[PDB]
Every structure is written in C-alpha cells, then in structure tokens.
Assembly symmetry: C4
C-alpha cells in the first residue's frame, strides 16, 4: 500500500545498533514495525483466538525458582548432548517455513550462518517448507562443527517423502523431526483477514508409518508435536529416539495445553517405568527468556526450541541478528544458572523448582462493570501549582 515508504525508513538506519538489543522481545518489536503486513501476519499468527500460543508462554510464570545460595558458581557450563551430538547450548532454532518473507535475500541460509558464525554453535531445525533448498542451507553453515536437523512433513505421495529422507541423510543432517500436529492446517485468522483484498501434508500419518520410517532410515527419529503423556509413552513403546512436546507454536489446535505443563506431567510418569534414558524429550512454545529454558531443563527436557524469536532476529539483522539472539539467550541462561546455584545442565533438577502452583490456571469471573466504573481509586500526592 505505498506505505512501505515508512517501512524502508525504519529498516534503513532508524534500526537500533545490534549492540543496543537487550532481549528477545526487542527483536520482536522491531520486526513488528518493519516487515510486510503479510510476513508479520504469517510469522506472528496463531490458531483461532490464539489462547494456546499465549498460554505456551504464560505457563512458565506458573513456576517459580527455589535457588541455592553460598555455592561456588565462578564457573558454569551450559553444554549438553542432544540426539548423540555434543551441543554448546541447551536450546535450538525450531523449524520455521518460508524465511524469505522476512529475510528476502538470504532466508534460511542466514539462520545457518548465525547458528555457526560466532563462538556458540546452536542446532538448526530445517523446515520441509523452507523457502531455500536443503542443499543451499547445509552448504551455507560456516562451521563443520555446527549441527542440523531436518523437519519432515510426510507427503501423501510417499515416494516424495522416501527420496527426501534419503537426500537429507546424505547431506549430513543428524536427525529427523516428523511433524504430527498438523494433519490439517490450523486456521490462522490474521493471514485470512489481510488476504481479503492438504497434499503437502498427509492427514493419514499413523503410528504404523513411524514404525515403518524407523526401518527405512538410520537417522534418529523425533516425533514432533506430542501434546499428551499417553502419546509420549507410545513413542517409547515403538522405540523412536525422541519427542517434541509441542503444539506448533499455538498454530494448530487452540486449547492445547502449554508443553511446559505437559512436560511437568510426563517426565515423572517416564520415571515410574525406567523410560527417562530411553526417550529424549524436547519442548518448544512461548520460550522467550533464559529462565524459561531453565524451567524446562529442570523438569527434564533434553532441549528447548524457539521459533518466532529467531525468525524475528533473522528478519531485522539477518545472520548477525541470529548470532546476537543466540548470545542474548546463552548469557541469560548462564547468568541465571549462577543465581540458581548450580554449574552444569545435569544439576538442573526438579528440586530447584517450586511447582506448588503449576495448576493455578485460572479464568476470573467477569468484571463487575458498574461497581468498578463508579469506584474512584486512591490518588498520589500532587506537586504544588506554583
């Protein structure tokens, strides 16, 4: 609408220096003002009323910390293992389709770059729906040490999916995340409203098919989009490597629970049956601060994913932005680890958390409109007129 005049003025040199970016929300704010209406709609959107998208995040605040004091914390290590690889941090960039809307010149290529160009090396989940080719993305990663996973929507045409699995294996991805929370497309209304002037994805995907995909590949399988303890147990029973507790960033079923709350529930069940070492359990949704990450890890998550935050960093400052987002988050984790009073990821245990109010998921009774309207609050002292 010939208004992106204003839009290139902000982008251009009105953007703050990267070094002035304090947190992940800063990236989000700037993204909100500079992207095209449709890039913004496509990235920021959730399903229907977007309660789950929001509740993904808010549920972290239903958990508090019980930190240890008087512990030597001079030295902290936040490295860990995810899917047989050693990783610098306990988080990753979750898979995120069509990055070219926000970063038109480089797209998914810049995520790879930002994930390996600096001191800390963060795993990248690549979308089957990436606007770049899997080859353009792997051959762009500036360090052999960095790792890459492939996210898979299994096609109705299973020949397509059988060759895809084979092409990514030989390109060096270290795992397959099979997305199972999107048999039909979540109704994302922000998109639709602006639009006013599936085959891609097989809705028949079965457990039996996952049993089958186990046999046709040597890459480790994580079932991405589990939303129930019962199905975590089912992933164990069929012997996949892992599972992402996820609701697609609240882009699919609205009133899916927060994965953090589901985590809290499933981990203890997985212990009453030996299964803690069997199944790596990942978590995404709503994660915006180092303490969110820490809460997850304390509950038993092997790793925690982020989508939108990185997507927004990438869309404003490309690869450099991604590297900074990594820096911001990695420091948030170390700094708060220290205040928690532990020194390694393996020391992050449930006794560090206060879980007594996890289930305080409330809906107030409607506000008394008349009563509140006529009431006049207390008032501060004023300053003389002089």
């Amino acid at each position: 609408t010939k208004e992106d005049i204003a839009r290139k003025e902000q982008l251009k040199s009105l953007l703050p220096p990267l070094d002035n970016i304090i947190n992940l929300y800063d990236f989000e704010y700037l993204a909100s003002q500079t992207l095209t209406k449709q890039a913004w709609a496509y990235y920021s959107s959730g399903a229907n009323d977007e309660v789950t998208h929001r509740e993904n995040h808010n549920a972290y605040h239903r958990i508090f910390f019980k930190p240890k004091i008087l512990v030597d914390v001079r030295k902290v290590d936040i490295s860990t293992d995810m899917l047989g690889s050693h990783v610098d941090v306990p988080f990753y960039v979750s898979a995120t389709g069509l990055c070219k809307l926000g970063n038109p010149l480089e797209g998914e290529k810049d995520v790879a770059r930002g994930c390996g160009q600096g001191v800390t090396k963060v795993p990248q989940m690549i979308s089957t729906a990436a606007s770049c080719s899997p080859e353009e993305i792997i051959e762009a990663a500036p360090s052999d040490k960095q790792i890459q996973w492939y996210q898979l929507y299994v096609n109705s045409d299973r020949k397509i999916t059988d060759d895809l699995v084979k092409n990514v294996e030989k390109l060096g991805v270290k795992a397959l995340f099979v997305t199972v929370d999107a048999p039909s497309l979540g109704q994302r209304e922000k998109d639709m409203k602006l639009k006013f002037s599936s085959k891609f994805i097989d809705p028949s995907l079965t457990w039996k098919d996952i049993e089958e995909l186990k046999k046709k590949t040597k890459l480790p399988i994580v079932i991405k989009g589990v939303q129930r303890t019962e199905d975590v147990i089912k992933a164990a029973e069929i012997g996949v490597s892992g599972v992402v507790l996820s609701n697609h960033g609240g882009r699919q079923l609205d009133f899916s629970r927060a994965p953090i709350e589901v985590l809290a529930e499933t981990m203890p069940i997985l212990e009453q049956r030996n299964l803690k070492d069997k199944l790596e359990v990942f978590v995404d949704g709503g994660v915006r601060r180092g303490t969110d990450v820490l809460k997850a890890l304390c509950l038993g998550a092997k790793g925690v994913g982020l989508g939108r935050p990185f997507l927004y960093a990438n869309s404003c400052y490309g690869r450099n932005g991604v590297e900074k987002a990594i820096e911001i988050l990695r420091d948030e984790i170390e700094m708060s680890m220290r205040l928690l009073g532990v020194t390694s990821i393996a020391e992050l245990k449930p006794d560090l958390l206060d879980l007594s109010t996890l289930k305080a998921r409330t809906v107030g009774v409607p506000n008394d409109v008349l009563y509140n309207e006529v009431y006049e609050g207390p008032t501060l002292t004023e300053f003389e007129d002089a």
Copy 2:
C-alpha cells in the same frame, strides 16, 4: 430512541457491509450488528440480566477446559453428524429460540433462519420461539427442505387452553419436539433495554406456577418428545429423568434471567458422571447452551456428553446483517471450526468425542482476584521496548 443516525446506520448497512465471503468467525457478525442494528434491536439482542456476569461466564467457563489431543491418528475423513431427539442431524449444534427476530431482520425475521438452516448442503435444527415475530405456520412453510428439523419452544400460559391449542397446532404443523422453557417464570431485568425506554415482571403469558406435575400432564397430551429448557442444576436433571421426559437443556436463557446462575458447561461436567453413577446414562438427552462462539466450545460440550449445543445470539447477528445467507455462513463457519479441530483432536466422529480427550483439572478455577493495589500499580513503571533511531 433513534436520531437521523438511521442514516449513519444506513450507509453502514448500505453496501459498506463487507462481502459474506470475508466473514471469518461468529464474532464478525456480532461486530457488524453492533454498528448497524437499531438501539432497541441491539439492546434486546445483546443484553443480559442485571450485571450480565452469568452471560459472560457462560462463555469464559469453556476456557477453564483444555484439550488432550491424540496424535498420529488417521484423520483423512471426519463426520460431525449425529442424532437428536430421534432425528438424524448433519451437525451437533442447533439454533436456539430467540424472540422478535424481526427487530434485526424487518422483512423476513424467523423465516430467514428457517431458510438458512435448511437451504444448503449442511442442515441445522431450528428451535422456534413462542415470542417469534413471525407465526409458526409462516416459519414452517418457509423451510426449504423436508429433511430439515424444526423444533418448537413453548412458554406455558396461565390459561392452559391457549397452551393446549398451541401444542396441538405445532404438532400438526409438523415440528419435531417441544422445548418447555422453565427458567423464566419472572422476566429477567435486562437493564440495557430499560436504559433506552427512559431517555429515548410477572405476566399471564408465562405462568409462574408451572410445576413438575404440569410437565407430567403435558406428556400425556402429545406424542412429541419433550425437553425441559432452563435446567440449572444436577438435582433437576435427575428429576427430569424420573418423570421420564426426553431431555433437558442445561441453560440459563443466555444470562438473561438469574444472574449468578453457573455456566451450563460447568453443570454439564458435574451432571453427566452422576448420570452414569445412577444408570440413567442414555435415558435423557442433555443439551447445553449459552456463550458458545467457537467449534472448540462445541467440542468440549460434546466430550462431556452433551447431545447437542445451542447458540442464540450469533445466529441473531448473522440473520440481522445478512439474512438467510448470513445464517448459512454462520452454519458453515461453525461446521468447519468443528471438523477442523476434530482432526487436530485425533477423532473422526461424534461418538468418539469422550471425556478422556479433555483436561478437566482446572474446571474449578473460577476466581475473583483481590482488588488491586491502585497506588502501587500507578507509580510502577514497566520495562519498555527499544525505540527506533530519533533520526
């Protein structure tokens, strides 16, 4: 009390209404109606009893329920048809009785909802109000389809002969059930309505004497299935089963009667397990209404074991902005919302919607916060986001 704001409202209405294809959800209809209906029409449709808490609560209580969706289930094909009161129904929801539909649709009123409910590929049951602005005969005649279900809403008169003639007439006109409304012996005080009359409660028409005996007698006078509409507690659900009526609507009249009646979704959750405990499982069909605006709302109620879920206001609004095709669009929006969240839920039929698909652990978290600390919050300044360069 309308100005020549009849004009501001008319240009609004007049071609400024967006194309029907651009309506995404049931709220849109609501929004459009709020700007285009006459002040009296808007007040009559949109209002509730006293402080309107029950009205809003009806809706919010749905949000105290979350889902436990099944993954990696074959959800290629999905069917949302079911049965209600002995008839096959394309859909698990229906249009509840609303009086005076001509305030919003002056030309056609209830006839246009009959048309919307029955014209297209998806057909929806319609409950006809005793306070309908059109006649029963007009509304039944108007029905474009033989396979479409019309039900009749009854207010029993103090003069029982009138009620007797009425029941005989609608049975003969071919309605398929009687919903006897029991939650309005006294008329709920809808203050938005009163606020117009100035600056702009017992009646013989609805008999405040209606009793359990009266319902018992009524069922010997007709072969139509009888439903008690306006049940607000489990004790009365059990009572309904005892007198052997067909069903019950857990309802509070859309928050238009008693304020601080519970959300029907909450009563449902309490009631159905107690109806297993006592065997009465499928002796009584249990319907729920009020505050339903999304397919996931409908799904939650069915998972608790509602036979069907009714909507009032959303259909009023569609009819008032877009007549018959508005009603069909409303039917399509909701139909699609239900099918699509069934797939994501991991079930393929109505019978497969069961309590184990719901997380019910925070159902009871209906809270009133301690008043906030206005001075503390006033002086407090929150974090801010980075700004763009000054220039």
Copy 3:
C-alpha cells in the same frame, strides 16, 4: 473552589427523574458528580488502600446459585424477623455518621422518612455520630410501624454513654448496636489529601463492659464489627442478642476479610454447637444487589445492612431517593427469589448456593509487560471504505 457552579447545574434539573433510576450504582454515580469534594471524600472513602472495602463486594462474586426450576413461584414473601420485630424486608439502612454533608437541609431525618413513607418499611440504624439529634430522627419517621435501632460508640466518659443508652430506650429504639471495630480511627486518605489546603470513642471497650451493658439495659445488644468466628462464639458465650459480621465498610482495618466469607465460615460452626437460634447474625459490606442479599440470607444471616448506597440515594433525592433505593432493592430480591425457586426467606438455605469456589481469592503473578506489549490481538472484520 467556585466550581460548585457546575455542581448546582447538575443537581438542578440535570438530575434524571427518580423513575429513571434502575439500580443502586446509578445513585452512586450521580452522588459522585454532585456532592462537595469533602462530602464525597467522607462517604466514598475506605481505609488505607481500600482493598477490604472493595473485597467486601467482590467476595459475593465468589458464590454462585444452584436455583430450582418448575416450582410455583407466583407468590413470594420476603418479610422476616429481626431482633423480635417483624420486618417487611430482609435488609436495613446501616448507621452512617454526618448525613448533613450530602443532605444539608434534612440529613438523618430524610432516611427515617424514606424508610417509612412508602409501602415497604425498612429498619434504620441511627449513628451516635448523626448530625441530627436522636429526637429529631425518631420524631420524623412517618409511620409508627417502622423500626429504629441505635448504634453506640461507648465514650471514655461512661456517664455520657449511660445517659445516652437511657435516652434512646425511652425514645423507643428497639435495639443497641455497639460498634467495636473502631477503637482507633481508620486512616481514610481521600479525606486527608483534600484536607491539605480519640475521646468520642473508648479504645478500652472490653467484653467485661458488654457483660456490664447487658445488665443496665433491656434493649437487645448486637455487637457490631465482628471479623472472626472466634469472637462470634464469644458473643454467644456472654449472651448478647446478635452480632454484625462487619469491618465498618472497609473504613477501619484494611485486609479484614469480606463478612460474606466470614459468614460462610461461622454459621456452620454455630450449628456444631446448638447456637443457630441463640445468636442473630447480621452482615454488611459491599452489598449492592438483591442477589448479594440473597447469598447472605442463604448462608444464614438474619439480615443484611447497607450504608453508602442509601447514603448516596439520600444525598441526591433525599427521602424520595431513599424510598426508591428501598424499592429497587426489594424488587431485586423478590424477582431473584422467584428465579431461585423459593417463596419465603426461611426457604433460603445453603443448598441453593454453589460454594465450591468461595476460597478462590487470588492474586495474579505480575503481568509480563514486554510480552504483552508486543503481542497484537486478533481483530474484527472492518466495514468497507466505500
């Protein structure tokens, strides 16, 4: 501040016709705009941060109704007995000092008039701190049938209080409410802020003194301002007639509980010890609708008081306003009784109430300012530009 120009313009003929007053809040609104800054401050005020004042009301919303349908409700009776007198309604006007601030010409006289001038006769509690004399108030009541109670602050000079008790007995008051929640004055900051350009009340009042006051008078004693089950039991043990569960309209101790919540707690204790008939138990605070009254009565209150609502009616439309406030409330009760499915005050029992969430008295965790600020809600469909 020569602004009460505006003030007499509203008062004068800008005031809506009495017949256009729908509810008790309407009176409150109009009062808010027309009273002097200091009358408003003096009436509307609560203690410190005014949480209790507000929580008095909000706690009613922590209770829902379980109403009976298919009950013949053609006929309802809301009459009852309070302190050996038959009363038309199950409520009363609580005592309220200095009514001349709002109604300068008539004051406490107009409350009496409004309480007996129309069809329904409501009891009046008279303040020891009334701006009118007890004689001017009793001799103004236009029906002998109407009843009057006296509220007593016992003076440090007990001669003053001994003659006062004697003067009100012979003037025909049918009871004494001894106020015990105000040994020191609650800090009411709205007053203080505007003011910037005790002996009256004995802080040594003891149980022993109430035992003593029992002997020196034949009028029935209600201890007004009980805030604990433990002290209700103490009023029983010393054989007073009644007790008002009250915190002075949140004008005294902030973070006193809502009397409704205290009611809910004490009534069942009074049954596990025979005491339900022994002690009449009254309740005030926050009551603004017929359903508030009904909730109280269902829990076992013998009556429910209101202050501010009547005070505001009286201050805008004097005696006529008071009569209308009575009408508004009395109809609210009958109408909702009917919808509840009972026909007499004695049928108002706890089984009519849903008490499962009485203790859902919550404080949210602080709002996530950044997260919420950047989030953009869903949006309604717009209307064409045309």
Copy 4:
C-alpha cells in the same frame, strides 16, 4: 542521558515539592522521586532484574494474606518496640542496604539516612551498603544518637584481605552486625539501566566463590553477629542454623537478581513452622525484605515470626526528595501505620503478633489467568450508568 530537562526537574524539585506534612504514605515519596530524580538515578533505584516479576511479586504476595482481628480488647496503649540481634529497637522495621545513595541525594547521601534514622523520638536501624557512596566512617560519624543501631552490609571480595580489613574496620567503627550478601555472585540484569547507557556480569569485587565454609571462617574472625542476606529457600535457612550463624534475611535483593525467586513473605510462611518442627525456634533470627510499603505488610511478616522487616526503595525515595527529614517522615508514616493497625488487630505488643491473627488459607493462590479472549471482550459492551439530562 539528561536534556535541559534538568530544568523541568529543577522547577519540580524547586519549591514545587509539597510540604513534608502533606505526605500521607510511602507511595507519595515514590511518586515525587519518579518526577524529580535524574534518569540514571531513577533507573538505578527503581529497577529490577529482567521482566521485574519477582520485584512486584514481593509486594503482591502480602495481599494473599488477610487478617483475623480480635475485637473488644483493651488497645488504649500499644508498643511496637522489639529486639534485633541483641539490641533494643524502637520499631520492628529497618532500612536495608542500598548502594549509591548520592545519585538521589548528591550532597549527603547515606549520611542523611543515618541522620533520619537516629535524630527523632523514633529510631530505626540502618544497614550500610558496601556500595555506599559515602564512607563507613562518614556515615557512622553522621549518626546523631548513641542509642541508634547501625549495621554493616558486606560483599566478600575475591581478595579476602580486603574483606578482612573491612570487617576489622567496621567492627572498630562500632557497627552492630554483619549482613553478608549471598544472592548476588553474578550481577542481576537491570534492563532499565542498560536502556539508558545505549541511547543516552562477574566481578572480583563480589566473589562468586563464596561458600558455606567461608561463612564459618568469617565467624571466627569477628565477635559481631552475622546474618546471611539473600536466603531464598527453607533448605538454606536450616543450613544457616547448622553453621550457627545469628540470622538470615529471606530476601531476593528487591527483585534485582534472580527473576522468579519467590516472595520472601511466602518463604517466611513455609520456613517458620519448619523451624518449630525441628526445635530451631529461636536459634536463628529471621528477617524479611522486599515489596514492603504498608504497616499491615510489616504486621503480616511479624505474625509469621520475622524478627524484623526491611525496606529499600521507599527510604531511597524519601531521602532523595527530602533528605534527612524525609527519612524521618517515612519512619513516622510506617510507625503510625503499624501502631494503628495493631489496635485494630487487637494486640498491644510485638510478641502478641502470632500466626493465629492471620488468615493464611489463600497464601498459595498465586495464579496466571488463561489469556483473554480478545475478540469476545472487544465486541462485548458493558452496562452503563445513568446520564445527567442532555440539558
């Protein structure tokens, strides 16, 4: 990053500040400071770690506690004096350590709080910060009264000789206890502060290695009572008692360090009963700080068994607007708030403040609402009040 808004702030400050007698509560000081301090001073004082939730929570958690006041008790005379760490104290509260008090009071800084704490009829303990802008000697010299209590806040340096000299110096200067701060091995990220630096974390100074052994050693090196400041869980309270230190401050540094540390009032409630269960009753004096702004806040903490309650920010604000007499006014406001609500509580001394005066049943109701339904709430129109006549 100050404009010649140094001027807008100076006319504000300059005689436009209201008379001290017109200040009603601790919030007023806060308000006045927010308009008169330099941007850096305001950010440094008012800010917390990351999203600042713990900071606000410190305060709100007090509101999860209600009172069970005793009636018809003789409350003519009331006494709020008590003892802390072996000294008699006029009051149950104290001024916690805040660094850099010269940002707000350029001329006098910490010396003016020393004066405010000790000048008048009511005297209040002062904890001196290691990051004080004035010197210990300056601040102690400044104390107008022999009977006034000064305590010292210690950050142990990586170079322990510096800490050793410091402890010997302040002991000799006559401070009455050591508060060793343990909740800041890493510096909390206070983003309001950072937001100025642009567009306008380990240090050798605070040793991140500090250990339980180090505290044990410290107590053999001084006769002063030692308090561990920044205890955030009961497990560490038990640990403090085991090594036989004098006391513990349940504190999270005013929400300036770990975000999502609990409200200390909540930890208090959990901790004290466990300190009966194990006998350790009065082996350890337990202090609480953070979010305290009213006398009833102080009362709640004492009823749970705190020995004393500390305040940071409110005293900073009084000192920054009004220097020494601001501090005294703050002391008087709070002193009066405590005495007056003791009477209404129905007790007459500190020892009489016990758990049975509190309603603790909703202490755990720390909730996060499900996000609200923006579309539902948007279209919804509430009831309105009557209007005055058009004319």
